[PDB]
């Protein structure tokens, strides 16, 4: 009875899971920024080559929620 509880407790494991999820979130943010840099470069290049022609303004973001 008494010993059957702590075995059912996994506070450390859940904390590790949460910390790993936070690491995932951090790396996701880093990817967001790197992708934003890529988008900046490509968008600016496309816009520069666009002036003087009728090239369509291709969307650069999926959609509002």
């Amino acid at each position: 009875t008494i010993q059957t509880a702590q075995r059912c407790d996994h506070s450390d494991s859940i904390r590790i899971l949460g910390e790993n999820i936070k690491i995932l979130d951090r790396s996701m943010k880093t990817m967001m920024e790197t992708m934003k840099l890529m988008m900046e470069k490509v968008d600016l290049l496309y816009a520069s080559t666009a002036v003087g022609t009728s090239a369509p303004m291709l969307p650069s973001h999926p959609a509002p929620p």
Binding site: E33, K36, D43, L44, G52, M57, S60, H61, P64
Partner: protein
């Protein structure tokens, strides 16, 4: 119709004329081409014709105008009671209208205006050959054909408008200049103006060069001024321009003006829009504009890198702002490699200074979501004055089909039907704006549809740039995007940025400016002015991409902002120049590089006006900080004023040079080539807010503002009323901003009379009396707007225009030869049959009159049918066509049921109403641009006929002689009562709440030369600190100078619950109001007179009638003080000098009405159901007030201690602690406030630094501090009734009331013995009382009760048969014997009245005052300084009770017995005896002999009178009881011991005070009193040390000299009392007392 303009409002364009001259096929062009003579000057040279127009002298009989202006000005001034000024004004205008040149200019202006009025808005096509002197103007549709002899000048109608506008501006300028010269230290500068006009008109250079000269005239003058009065930093700005090489005469004239007076030169040269305007060179201007838009000064990669740097600095500044505001870092993410310092700062939450110099560290920090973007703008700004187009399918509309056919050879295929709903309003009505976020989604996604990728470039009108200053008119979607982005940036970002916050805030900015105005003169804090000439055509996508991406991440509006930085790359730009259309291929314009451009780098002018400011501040800050110089930035956009403070390291010259170099370098990197031809460094001249300060004093704008003709007849069809209203608004604005009220008023009267002359027929014009009465009638009682009857001109705040109107009419009737019948037949009063409560709620001060002259607008009529057509119904278009007017009328009538009818509160209630918001929205939708122009354009015959209809109607109305309501009974007696009666009659319910009287009627000025006592019974006294003269008028003196509806409803709920009322109906109405919004649960004076005010001291001594009772009267102090200062200004400017103090006495008794402190009891249950469709989205106060006051004062002191000497001249307490009365404060039991302050101070427990600062400044007194404390603490009642003080009174020793208050308020940190006793009282809920509702508690405590009484404590008196008790007043003072001798002499002579001159010692006068059964008459000569000093010194009511103020202020020489003169009849004289030859029973040594009119007065038999409760002037705190002296001595000893522990505190001043008590104790003990004693003070082993012998090298030696035995100590020198003193005293204190 045609020629639908009466003022110049479009840029001149010669394209149409050139096209016509090329054999155009248009019939009217053919007609015009057949009339030009042989020599046809090009339209570019239109000014070359209109400069040669000369009318025969004296063509218009304007003599009646001169007489009328004279009479009107005389009446106005007399009504103001400044009669002595009349002459000046009464002459100046006459002179202005008698000078041949000015008269000729005025006649030319009248002829021009008549010509304009005979042609504009004409049904006819071509008007016959109108004559304008030697011209032969011949209009043809929108084309004019000027003709001076054998010289035609075929031009566009806009050119003629420009010429007429030039003539009007010149007339305004001449009249204003003459009037100003009259009222001006060095007057009559009209000659220079005329010479300048002739010189400029003599220029003969080509068009471009002429306009270059005209444009450069003003900057060149600035350069000349700077190059002559730059003390520190050298300037060469004047050398850039080429005026000296092109117009030598103009250069010489400017040099002469500079020699005379720089301010005069700056004023005269500021008139830019008064010389004929240029014809923009479209062919060479549009191409240059387009090329400049898409030029690349920097490679895109370098631009992107610098953009990243700008992003870094922006992040740093935003983080600093956010943490300074919310005391925590915003949600941020640190990329790998972030510096540990940033990590720690975020973890704790703070802003380490090192960041500001190390912004580069922030490149690794990215700000996460901080807010959200509100895709829902309010209608108020969405439809502001900015023309737009429906969509891309509209460009064909803005061109001429015939010109397009001629240019290419094919039709335009213009859609016959209107392809778009005109301007913003029509498109809005069509229902497009129903769903905003759905409309902005393409921006969010980043692909704006092809329909919204067009922008039209429109040249800017009324400018001197030959090549144009194109601005942008954009399709609807882009306009909505710009509005939303600008709102978001202005709300959720800009306030955080430090640089812009200090300019957004009204108060903060002012402080800064004041500081600068007080520093540039001193030789430090110079200024750099930068002028980015290519600001708008600058920013490229790369520079904005980083910050734009960061912003998009902030608001989680994916790519919403970023789209703006690349949109111009996909946009199509065209030039709005009819008769020059771009070619079309497939329904879209083609690119030619001159008229059309497919895609450019920048969005255009105005677009993203905010983000650009953010970036500009960013790179300027980067430029400056990298050289480590303190600075401030004030940016108006194109131009930036950078204040650079002095640095001890280098002089100003080197600092300025380095700053300029850095700014150039760091603005080049951002692709903004900053040519050094418009940026200059100065320390004497600087511009901000379009005001040009010179040496910190604003340069008068009279010449500029009065010469700046506005649009006129705006948003309506032409009519006399609109023109008069615009003129009146211009005059009021000129007076309010920066101008002499007299100059503005006189110029306004002259211009108003001229305008009437233009329109009205000879029948009315040639009638002097009728013209005068018509000009004085005013709009209030119903009449054409006028600049005369505007009390708001002189005064700043809210004004009641009715009583002033009646006062003016009374004065007119009484002075001029005009009878009441004429006024009746001019006013034509007619009470409305029924109350129109809507008008009252909209305008509380108005009457129920029928405003016959007011123009009835019909804009609602056009849009009412527009919504009906096409049945479009999704928005305001449909759910605002409900009977909103009827619902508003119902609500107003419902509000009318208030028993004590209060129109002010009525309007307040009818402000938090959904119906009120709907009405306001309708009004803005009507009275705005982009609607009238659109509505007028679609339907214009209506306005064409309406103009003539209105003109005929008004002429007929003015001509008829039938009288209206007999206004006789309201043109006699007090104007205040008359106004009340008139309001009651016209309304029928006796309005109470708005009748504040006419100050001039209320108060009559007078000079103290011969003022009688009665005049001083109720008066406000002004004292000039020296003789006043015109010089003082400029040199400063020394003396001190949406969602809101729900919160408003809750605030009003709290306010009305505080006032102790129970109105179920009002609660029901408020609940109904809140139901819709969804909450269904629960001194200062005016600008003109400040400088003169600084040399004057105000007061309030009429308390004898109107300030003793707690009841508040109708008086308005701001207005009264402004009026008095205006009187002084008038006396000065009329050639007089104000030497003696002068008063404003109370004249009209009935104009002082006790304010009705009643509450409204609204009777009928409200019937305003609601407007569900509107608004889509959703214990006694004395204790609380006392605790709030204590904590407020504590925090005020806490902020004052921080401020330095340079930051204390500002009187702005922490939060506006000053706007309070005196009685209100006296209501609160002061004991409570004192306990609260003590508890706050002890709880605060500040360390040594703050404690030392408090000690020093409180023993001193500066700023919103002990200064205002003493202000509040004149009344001695509070002191003896202040429970803390009475217990403390026997515990401390003082020397003046300015020291007792300091000891009382510093008790917490000096005498814990009693403060820790009173600290017992406490209540947690009282602590929670927030200060945001501070005023609520004060209002709740407004009528608590009655303030305490003053009592009259006695002084040691004497009698013939008395008992010598040995007590004598002023024992410590040297004048002790003198004061006692005077008292004995007075009692021996049995005087009932005594005169005291200011020469007598203040202490002696006070002691004489405390005598009973004696009347004191100070010879103050109108200056209450001496009496104020006596009142401050005393601590009882004897002075206030026994000093006759009305007689004292009215007495220049004594009448009877007096003291202070050395000789004269009845003068009391004391002759000091060389040797004391008599031992008076009361006075041991008689040191003086009393004489009266050369006769000695015997006082030998005099003896002491039985003493009783004595005043504090006897210094009871140290009483006969040595134990009391022991208490005081021990307390001071402990306080000094505590002070010694304060590092860095100058303890010497306290040590002298303590040594005084030590001397007293030594005298008591019998020890010798050494003249000098050396004290050694220091902290040894963490303990205080105060010893006369140096036993530690660290003790600071302090020497105290001048020690003398206090005679007051003689009484305490009892033999048995010596032992009791030393019993129990501290060992150190005993050692100090005992002299070795």
């Amino acid at each position: 119709i045609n020629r639908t303009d009466q003022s110049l409002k479009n840029p001149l364009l010669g394209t149409e004329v050139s096209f016509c001259l090329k054999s155009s096929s248009l019939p009217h062009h053919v007609r015009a081409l057949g009339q030009i003579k042989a020599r046809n000057l090009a339209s570019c040279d239109y000014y070359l014709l209109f400069r040669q127009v000369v009318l025969p002298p004296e063509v218009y009989p304007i003599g009646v105008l001169i007489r009328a202006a004279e009479a009107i000005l005389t009446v106005i001034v007399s009504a103001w009671k400044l009669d002595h000024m009349t002459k000046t004004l009464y002459s100046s205008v006459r002179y202005a209208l008698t000078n041949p040149r000015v008269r000729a200019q005025l006649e030319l202006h009248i002829a021009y205006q008549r010509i304009v009025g005979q042609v504009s808005y004409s049904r006819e096509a071509d008007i016959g050959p109108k004559r304008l002197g030697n011209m032969s103007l011949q209009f043809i549709q929108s084309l004019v054909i000027a003709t001076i002899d054998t010289t035609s000048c075929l031009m566009t109608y806009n050119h003629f408008l420009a010429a007429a506008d030039t003539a009007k501006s010149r007339c305004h300028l001449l009249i204003a200049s003459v009037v100003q010269g009259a009222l001006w230290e060095q007057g009559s500068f009209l000659d220079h103006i005329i010479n300048m006009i002739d010189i400029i008109d003599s220029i003969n250079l080509p068009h471009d060069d002429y306009f270059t000269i005209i444009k450069s005239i003003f900057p060149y003058s600035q350069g000349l001024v700077m190059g002559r009065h730059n003390v520190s930093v050298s300037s060469d700005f004047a050398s850039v321009f080429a005026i000296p090489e092109l117009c030598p005469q103009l250069d010489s004239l400017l040099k002469k003006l500079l020699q005379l007076d720089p301010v005069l030169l700056l004023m005269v040269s500021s008139v830019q829009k008064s010389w004929y305007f240029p014809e923009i060179r479209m062919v060479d201007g549009s191409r240059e504009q387009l090329h400049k838009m898409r030029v690349e000064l920097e490679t895109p990669q370098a631009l992107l890198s610098y953009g990243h740097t700008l992003l870094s600095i922006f992040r740093a500044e935003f983080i600093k702002g956010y943490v300074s505001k919310n005391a925590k870092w915003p949600p941020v993410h640190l990329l790998p490699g972030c510096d540990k310092s940033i990590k720690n700062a975020r973890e704790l939450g703070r802003w380490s200074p090192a960041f500001d110099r190390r912004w580069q560290l922030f490149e690794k920090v990215v700000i996460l979501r901080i807010a959200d973007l509100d895709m829902d703008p309010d209608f108020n700004d969405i439809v502001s004055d900015k023309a737009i187009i429906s969509s891309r399918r509209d460009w064909v509309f803005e061109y001429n089909a015939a010109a397009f056919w001629k240019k290419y050879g094919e039709r335009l295929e213009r859609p016959p039907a209107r392809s778009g709903p005109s301007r913003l309003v029509n498109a809005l009505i069509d229902g497009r704006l129903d769903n905003i976020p759905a409309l902005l989604e393409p921006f969010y996604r980043g692909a704006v549809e092809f329909e919204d990728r067009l922008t039209v470039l429109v040249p800017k009108e009324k400018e001197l740039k030959v090549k144009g200053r194109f601005f942008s008119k954009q399709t609807l979607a882009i306009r909505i995007y710009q509005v939303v982005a600008e709102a978001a940036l202005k709300n959720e970002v800009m306030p955080y940025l430090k640089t812009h916050s200090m300019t957004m805030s009204s108060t903060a900015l002012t402080h800064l400016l004041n500081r600068l105005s007080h520093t540039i003169t001193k030789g430090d804090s110079f200024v750099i002015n930068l002028d980015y000439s290519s600001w708008c055509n600058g920013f490229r996508p790369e520079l904005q991409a980083p910050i734009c991406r960061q912003l998009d991440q902030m608001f989680n509006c994916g790519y919403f902002f970023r789209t703006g930085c690349t949109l111009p790359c996909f946009t199509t730009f065209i030039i709005q120049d009819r008769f020059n259309p771009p070619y079309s291929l497939s329904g879209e314009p083609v690119e030619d590089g001159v008229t059309c451009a497919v895609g450019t780098k920048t969005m255009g002018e105005g677009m993203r006006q905010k983000l650009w400011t953010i970036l500009t501040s960013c790179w300027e800050i980067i430029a400056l900080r990298e050289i480590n110089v303190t600075f401030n930035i004030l940016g108006q956009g194109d131009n930036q004023t950078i204040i650079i403070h002095k640095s001890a390291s280098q002089n100003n010259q080197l600092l300025a040079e380095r700053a300029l170099g850095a700014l150039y370098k760091h603005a080049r990197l951002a692709g903004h080539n900053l040519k050094v031809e418009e940026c200059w460094v100065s320390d004497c001249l600087y511009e901000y807010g379009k005001k040009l300060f010179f040496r910190g004093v604003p340069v008068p704008g009279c010449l500029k503002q009065l010469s700046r003709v506005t649009d006129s007849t705006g948003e309506l069809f032409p009519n006399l009323y609109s023109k008069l209203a615009c003129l009146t608004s211009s005059c009021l604005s000129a007076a309010m901003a920066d101008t002499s009220p007299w100059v503005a008023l006189a110029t306004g009267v002259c211009l108003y009379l001229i305008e009437l002359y233009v329109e009205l027929p000879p029948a009315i014009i040639q009638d002097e009396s009728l013209l005068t009465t018509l000009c004085l009638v005013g709009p209030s009682i119903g009449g054409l707007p006028t600049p005369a009857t505007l009390p708001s001109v002189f005064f700043r705040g809210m004004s009641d225009p009715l009583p002033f109107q009646l006062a003016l009419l009374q004065t007119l009737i009484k002075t001029t030869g005009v009878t009441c019948s004429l006024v009746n037949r001019v006013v034509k009063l007619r009470i409305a049959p029924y109350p129109d409560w809507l008008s009252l709620v909209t305008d509380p001060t108005s009457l129920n009159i029928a405003q016959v002259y007011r123009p009835e607008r019909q804009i609602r009529r056009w849009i009412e049918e527009a919504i009906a057509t096409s049945s479009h119904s999704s928005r305001i278009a449909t759910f605002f066509q409900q009977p909103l007017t009827e619902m508003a009328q119902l609500l107003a009538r419902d509000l009318s049921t208030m028993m004590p009818l209060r129109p002010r509160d009525m309007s307040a209630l009818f402000a938090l109403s959904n119906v009120a918001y709907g009405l306001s929205i309708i009004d803005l939708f009507q009275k705005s641009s982009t609607v009238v122009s659109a509505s007028q354009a679609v339907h214009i015959e209506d306005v064409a006929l309406e103009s003539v209809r209105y003109k005929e109607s008004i002429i007929q109305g003015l001509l008829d002689t039938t009288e209206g309501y007999n206004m006789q009974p309201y043109l006699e007696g007090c104007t205040y009562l008359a106004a009340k009666q008139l309001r009651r009659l016209t309304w029928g319910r006796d309005l109470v709440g708005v009748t504040m009287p006419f100050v001039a009627e209320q108060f009559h000025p007078h000079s103290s030369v011969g003022a009688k006592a009665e005049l001083y019974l109720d008066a406000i006294i002004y004292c000039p600190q020296e003789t006043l003269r015109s010089h003082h008028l400029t040199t400063r003196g020394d003396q001190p100078l949406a969602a809101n509806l729900v919160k408003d409803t809750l605030v009003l709920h709290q306010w009305y619950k505080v006032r102790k009322v129970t109105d179920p109906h009002l609660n029901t109405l408020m609940a109904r109001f809140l139901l819709e919004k969804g909450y269904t649960s629960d001194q200062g004076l005016t600008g003109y007179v400040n400088i003169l005010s600084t040399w004057l001291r105000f007061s309030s001594d009429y308390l004898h009638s109107f300030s003793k009772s707690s009841d508040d009267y109708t008086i308005h102090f701001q207005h009264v003080f402004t009026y008095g200062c205006l009187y002084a200004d008038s006396v000065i400017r009329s050639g007089g000098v104000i030497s003696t103090p002068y008063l404003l006495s109370a004249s009209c008794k009935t104009c002082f009405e006790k304010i009705d402190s009643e509450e409204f009891v609204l009777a009928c249950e409200p019937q305003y159901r609601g407007a569900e469709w509107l608004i889509s989205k959703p214990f006694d106060p004395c204790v609380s007030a006392s605790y709030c006051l204590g904590i407020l004062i504590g925090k005020s002191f806490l902020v004052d201690i921080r401020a330095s000497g340079h930051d204390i001249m500002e009187q702005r307490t922490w939060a506006n602690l000053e706007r309070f009365s005196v009685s209100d404060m006296q209501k609160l039991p002061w004991s409570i406030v004192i306990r609260s302050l003590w508890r706050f101070l002890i709880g605060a427990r500040l360390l040594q630094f703050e404690k030392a600062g408090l000690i020093r400044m409180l023993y001193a007194a500066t700023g919103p501090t002990f200064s205002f404390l003493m202000k509040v603490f004149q009344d001695s009642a509070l002191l003896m009734d202040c429970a803390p003080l009475d217990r403390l009174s026997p515990r401390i020793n003082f020397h003046s009331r300015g020291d007792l208050v300091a000891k009382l308020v510093l008790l917490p940190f000096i005498n814990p013995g009693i403060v820790e006793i009173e600290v017992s009282g406490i209540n947690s809920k009282y602590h929670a009382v927030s200060e945001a509702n501070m005023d609520l508690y004060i209002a709740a405590a407004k009528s608590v009760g009655v303030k305490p009484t003053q009592f009259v404590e006695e002084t040691n008196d004497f009698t013939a048969r008395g008992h010598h008790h040995g007590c004598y007043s002023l024992s410590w003072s040297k004048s002790r014997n003198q004061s006692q001798v005077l008292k004995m002499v007075v009692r021996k002579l049995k005087l009932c009245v005594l005169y005291i001159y200011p020469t007598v010692d203040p202490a002696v006068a006070l002691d004489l005052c405390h005598l009973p059964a004696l009347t004191i008459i100070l010879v103050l000569g109108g200056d209450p300084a001496y009496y104020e000093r006596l009142l401050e010194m005393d601590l009882c009511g004897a002075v206030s009770s026994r000093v006759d103020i009305p007689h004292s202020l009215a007495a220049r020489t004594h009448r009877g017995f007096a003291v202070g003169p050395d000789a004269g009849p009845g003068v009391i004289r004391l002759d000091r005896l060389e040797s004391v030859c008599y031992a008076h029973p009361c006075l041991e040594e008689l040191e003086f002999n009393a004489y009266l009119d050369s006769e000695l007065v015997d006082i030998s038999d005099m003896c002491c009178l039985p003493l009783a409760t004595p005043c504090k002037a006897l210094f009871r705190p140290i009483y006969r009881s040595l134990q009391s002296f022991r208490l005081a001595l021990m307390d001071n000893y402990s306080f000094v011991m505590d002070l010694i522990m304060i590092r860095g505190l100058d303890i010497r001043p306290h040590l002298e005070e303590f040594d005084e008590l030590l001397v007293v104790g030594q005298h008591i003990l019998g020890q010798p009193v050494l003249v000098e004693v050396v004290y050694y003070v220091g902290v040894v082993r963490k303990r205080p040390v105060l010893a006369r012998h140096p036993w530690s090298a660290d003790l600071k030696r302090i020497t105290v000299g001048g020690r003398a035995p206090c005679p007051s100590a003689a009484r305490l020198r009892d033999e048995d009392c010596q032992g009791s003193l030393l019993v129990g005293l501290p060992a150190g204190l005993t050692q100090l007392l005992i002299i070795d």
